[PDB]
Amino acid sequence: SLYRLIFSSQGIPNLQPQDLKDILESSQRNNPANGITGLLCYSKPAFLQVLEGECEQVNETYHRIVQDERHHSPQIIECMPIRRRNFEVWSMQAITVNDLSTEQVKTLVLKYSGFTTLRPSAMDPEQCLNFLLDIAKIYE
Amino acid sequence: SLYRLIFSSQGIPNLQPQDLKDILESSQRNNPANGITGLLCYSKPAFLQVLEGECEQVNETYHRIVQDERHHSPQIIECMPIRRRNFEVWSMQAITVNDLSTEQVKTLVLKYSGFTTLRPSAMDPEQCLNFLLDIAKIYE
């Protein structure tokens, strides 16, 4: 009943600043409640993110996520029953990747991937989550 | 880059043999090119799909299956990269299970479940793997 879901996506080519905080209000009004927790990451245009919570919640959310007019082509990287939550999960939070490339952050991309750019496309699930973890560290 | 995805959904109140013949002619047609192979399985109401391939046309197919309406509310029990394929024989293989099924199949259902009717959300990843495994193991 306690799952972890990983997957990445592609943000519609015309997405604006005022759209993402609206993705936030959502994640911060729709998750805490659901014992949905974890971390969402943006690197124009690449998306990554892990979900953790009740299996049925994890799912209730992901499939609700997929129809959003705001991006296309989502790749589940992992969905698996887990032993314990990793993010103490103050919230399903969001980080924009700058890109801004870089100050100690580009490094985190030769490490878990190759080039300086966020291609969740090279990542294996472990290098996938390993990364979502390392970034949050140096950040609150 | 290989990956395996296992999921189960709820059929609509009225799927007929005619309505079951239609999901398959679409996966021995699409999936061959699509590169999709696996067992599907159907004990009214639920289907219980296993799908095998690389990460892209997996999601491609699934997210498409979920766009389907013949069922509703899919759930991912497990997605992640594998060693080797287990369902390579059929580009898909439908297999109806029902209380009318042979007294044999009825008991393979019981070997992994707490009740005699196929119930996915009460079965862990291993249980479904082997069920589907042992159940294709015995279907030409």
Ligand SMILES: Cc1cc2nc3c(=O)[nH]c(=O)nc-3n(C[C@H](O)[C@H](O)[C@H](O)COP(=O)(O)O)c2cc1C
């Ligand atoms: C990358 C991305 C991640 C999102 N994550 C969530 C989420 O975790 N929870 C959520 O409720 N909405 C999330 N959304 C937004 C939903 O698609 C949608 O806005 C939300 O379900 C609407 O909720 P509302 O009924 O409160 O307005 C996300 C959107 C994007 C683009």
Ligand SMILES: Cc1cc2nc3c(=O)[nH]c(=O)nc-3n(C[C@H](O)[C@H](O)[C@H](O)COP(=O)(O)O)c2cc1C
């Ligand atoms: C439970 C279930 C599983 C399905 N699995 C597949 C599948 O593996 N591959 C596929 O192409 N269609 C699958 N479908 C049906 C697709 O939603 C749809 O029939 C297909 O994308 C249409 O293909 P067509 O345009 O060639 O007719 C499934 C449908 C259901 C209800």
